[PDB]
Design an enzyme around this catalytic site. Structure first.
Site, PDB file in Angstrom:
ATOM      1  N   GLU A 123      21.306  -9.251  47.263  1.00 28.43           N
ATOM      2  CA  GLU A 123      20.916 -10.233  46.265  1.00 28.43           C
ATOM      3  C   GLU A 123      21.180 -11.687  46.630  1.00 28.43           C
ATOM      4  O   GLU A 123      20.472 -12.579  46.171  1.00 28.43           O
ATOM      5  CB  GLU A 123      21.623  -9.916  44.947  1.00 28.43           C
ATOM      6  CG  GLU A 123      21.157  -8.632  44.288  1.00 28.43           C
ATOM      7  CD  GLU A 123      19.828  -8.796  43.594  1.00 28.43           C
ATOM      8  OE1 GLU A 123      19.802  -9.156  42.399  1.00 28.43           O
ATOM      9  OE2 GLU A 123      18.803  -8.577  44.252  1.00 28.43           O
TER      10      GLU A 123
HETATM   11  C1  LIG Z   1       9.678 -10.938  39.196  1.00 25.69           C
HETATM   12  C2  LIG Z   1      11.020 -10.703  39.875  1.00 25.69           C
HETATM   13  O1  LIG Z   1      11.071 -10.089  40.949  1.00 25.69           O
HETATM   14  N1  LIG Z   1      12.098 -11.183  39.256  1.00 25.69           N
HETATM   15  C3  LIG Z   1      13.400 -10.600  39.509  1.00 25.69           C
HETATM   16  C4  LIG Z   1      14.109 -10.252  38.199  1.00 25.69           C
HETATM   17  O2  LIG Z   1      13.347  -9.302  37.460  1.00 25.69           O
HETATM   18  C5  LIG Z   1      15.521  -9.688  38.483  1.00 25.69           C
HETATM   19  O3  LIG Z   1      16.251  -9.611  37.239  1.00 25.69           O
HETATM   20  C6  LIG Z   1      16.251  -8.406  36.562  1.00 25.69           C
HETATM   21  O4  LIG Z   1      15.037  -8.341  35.799  1.00 25.69           O
HETATM   22  C7  LIG Z   1      14.953  -7.147  34.995  1.00 25.69           C
HETATM   23  C8  LIG Z   1      13.575  -7.110  34.354  1.00 25.69           C
HETATM   24  O5  LIG Z   1      13.037  -8.416  34.212  1.00 25.69           O
HETATM   25  C9  LIG Z   1      16.071  -7.146  33.955  1.00 25.69           C
HETATM   26  O6  LIG Z   1      15.961  -5.948  33.160  1.00 25.69           O
HETATM   27  C10 LIG Z   1      16.623  -5.895  31.947  1.00 25.69           C
HETATM   28  O7  LIG Z   1      17.857  -5.209  32.180  1.00 25.69           O
HETATM   29  C11 LIG Z   1      18.645  -5.057  30.988  1.00 25.69           C
HETATM   30  C12 LIG Z   1      19.967  -4.437  31.401  1.00 25.69           C
HETATM   31  O8  LIG Z   1      19.812  -3.592  32.529  1.00 25.69           O
HETATM   32  C13 LIG Z   1      17.898  -4.193  29.980  1.00 25.69           C
HETATM   33  O9  LIG Z   1      18.677  -4.101  28.782  1.00 25.69           O
HETATM   34  C14 LIG Z   1      19.342  -2.906  28.605  1.00 25.69           C
HETATM   35  O10 LIG Z   1      18.393  -1.968  28.081  1.00 25.69           O
HETATM   36  C15 LIG Z   1      18.975  -0.678  27.804  1.00 25.69           C
HETATM   37  C16 LIG Z   1      17.855   0.234  27.350  1.00 25.69           C
HETATM   38  O11 LIG Z   1      16.840   0.303  28.332  1.00 25.69           O
HETATM   39  C17 LIG Z   1      20.070  -0.818  26.758  1.00 25.69           C
HETATM   40  O12 LIG Z   1      20.630   0.454  26.491  1.00 25.69           O
HETATM   41  C18 LIG Z   1      21.143  -1.767  27.285  1.00 25.69           C
HETATM   42  O13 LIG Z   1      22.151  -1.961  26.304  1.00 25.69           O
HETATM   43  C19 LIG Z   1      20.511  -3.110  27.624  1.00 25.69           C
HETATM   44  N2  LIG Z   1      21.524  -3.975  28.197  1.00 25.69           N
HETATM   45  C20 LIG Z   1      21.345  -5.292  28.243  1.00 25.69           C
HETATM   46  C21 LIG Z   1      22.016  -6.038  29.383  1.00 25.69           C
HETATM   47  O14 LIG Z   1      20.671  -5.909  27.415  1.00 25.69           O
HETATM   48  C22 LIG Z   1      16.521  -4.787  29.663  1.00 25.69           C
HETATM   49  O15 LIG Z   1      15.761  -3.855  28.899  1.00 25.69           O
HETATM   50  C23 LIG Z   1      15.767  -5.104  30.954  1.00 25.69           C
HETATM   51  N3  LIG Z   1      14.566  -5.848  30.639  1.00 25.69           N
HETATM   52  C24 LIG Z   1      13.403  -5.437  31.126  1.00 25.69           C
HETATM   53  C25 LIG Z   1      12.170  -6.279  30.816  1.00 25.69           C
HETATM   54  O16 LIG Z   1      13.296  -4.418  31.812  1.00 25.69           O
HETATM   55  C26 LIG Z   1      17.422  -7.185  34.667  1.00 25.69           C
HETATM   56  O17 LIG Z   1      18.459  -7.319  33.712  1.00 25.69           O
HETATM   57  C27 LIG Z   1      17.485  -8.357  35.635  1.00 25.69           C
HETATM   58  N4  LIG Z   1      18.685  -8.234  36.440  1.00 25.69           N
HETATM   59  C28 LIG Z   1      19.564  -9.235  36.499  1.00 25.69           C
HETATM   60  C29 LIG Z   1      20.796  -9.041  37.377  1.00 25.69           C
HETATM   61  O18 LIG Z   1      19.420 -10.290  35.885  1.00 25.69           O
HETATM   62  C30 LIG Z   1      16.299 -10.611  39.449  1.00 25.69           C
HETATM   63  C31 LIG Z   1      17.624 -10.029  39.944  1.00 25.69           C
HETATM   64  O19 LIG Z   1      17.464  -8.763  40.575  1.00 25.69           O
HETATM   65  O20 LIG Z   1      15.509 -10.950  40.619  1.00 25.69           O
HETATM   66  C32 LIG Z   1      14.271 -11.587  40.279  1.00 25.69           C
HETATM   67  O21 LIG Z   1      13.639 -11.967  41.451  1.00 25.69           O
END
Ligand SMILES: CC(=O)N[C@@H]1[C@@H](O)[C@H](O[C@@H]2O[C@H](CO)[C@@H](O[C@@H]3O[C@H](CO)[C@@H](O[C@@H]4O[C@H](CO)[C@@H](O)[C@H](O)[C@H]4NC(C)=O)[C@H](O)[C@H]3NC(C)=O)[C@H](O)[C@H]2NC(C)=O)[C@@H](CO)O[C@H]1O
Ligand code: NI
Length: 268
Positions: A123
């Protein structure tokens, strides 16, 4: 102050439920007022403890948790694992410098350092201060600004970190690893039930990059299936991994192997 933070917190009252009640319940416990295990349901026990907490602190004691009460909780709780216990690495952009750090986070969270070391490597090539030119992504774990906030609000107290408005703590290696481990645990709990196996570093990375919901659908969506068909959003966002050079859509198996391949390059 802590008042501005308590100011943006959700105003809770008996009957409410969700992450907020859970955070409330935890802070109560960490403050000495036991409300049992945090379950996210603002019932009688939490209500009584709140009233008593408000009375012990000269707060309008009607049982409603607003700015002033939140402010008092952020001020009186004692972190069960203060982050300072986690050492700063003696150098940025250094795998060997992050290890001792990851070892501490493993002992504190349970998550294996190797897994942590891999993620940080893939990362930010270990630059805990790096900020992706393409998005919010910042630090060792390239935390977006959104999920970081949600992470800091549900686990921060656990390590003594209430707020981070700027989201600037993502530049801090320590708190980044801690939150990283917490996210991994969240994700490894969503996956094991569906994957009749211990989620692997790649399974886990998929959840980290694409989000757990999608990783879930994906890690269980037919090898020879056309990924783009099932993940238009991600495909559009990362065509390079979802589309062949000629523009044809890759299969699930191919995408998986490519990912596993990218992870394979930052392991032990
Ligand atoms: C276009 C591109 O390549 N961009 C990259 C980014 O996408 C990436 O960051 C990560 O992005 C994803 C999706 O956009 C994001 O996903 C979210 O993750 C959270 C937690 O894992 C989810 O929330 C959880 O959902 C579950 C149920 O499914 C719940 O039970 C739980 O309690 C929730 N917890 C939280 C934290 O809220 C979201 O549902 C999910 N959203 C989506 C749209 O899928 C990741 O969190 C991002 N990761 C990080 C570390 O930020 C980035 C880094 O890899 O790189 C970019 O380039
Ligand atoms: Ni109040």
């Amino acid at each position: 102050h802590h008042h501005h933070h308590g100011s943006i917190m959700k105003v809770l009252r008996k009957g409410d439920r969700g992450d907020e009640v859970c955070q409330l319940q935890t802070l109560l416990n960490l403050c000495g007022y036991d409300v049992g295990k945090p379950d996210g349901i603002f019932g009688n026990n939490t209500f009584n403890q709140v009233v008593k907490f408000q009375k012990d602190n000269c707060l309008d004691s009607d049982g409603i948790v607003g700015k002033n009460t939140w402010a008092e909780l952020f001020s009186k709780y004692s972190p069960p694992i203060p982050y300072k216990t986690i050492p700063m690495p003696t150098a940025n952009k250094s795998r060997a410098a992050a290890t001792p750090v990851m070892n501490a986070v493993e002992n504190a969270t349970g998550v294996r350092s190797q897994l942590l070391l891999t993620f940080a490597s893939i990362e930010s090539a270990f630059d805990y201060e790096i900020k992706a030119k393409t998005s919010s992504a910042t630090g060792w774990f390239q935390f977006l600004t959104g999920t970081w906030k949600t992470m800091i609000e549900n686990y921060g107290m656990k390590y003594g970190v209430l707020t981070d408005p700027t989201g600037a703590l993502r530049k801090d290696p320590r708190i980044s690893a801690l939150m990283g481990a917490e996210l991994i645990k969240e994700n490894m709990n969503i996956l094991r039930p569906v994957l009749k196996r211990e989620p692997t570093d790649t399974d886990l990375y998929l959840a980290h990059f694409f989000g757990p919901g999608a990783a879930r659908r994906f890690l269980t969506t037919g090898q020879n299936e056309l990924a783009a068909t099932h993940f238009p959003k991600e495909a559009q966002a990362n065509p390079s991994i979802f589309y062949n050079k000629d523009g044809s859509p890759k299969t699930i198996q191919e995408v998986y192997n490519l990912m596993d391949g990218k992870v394979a390059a930052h392991r032990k």
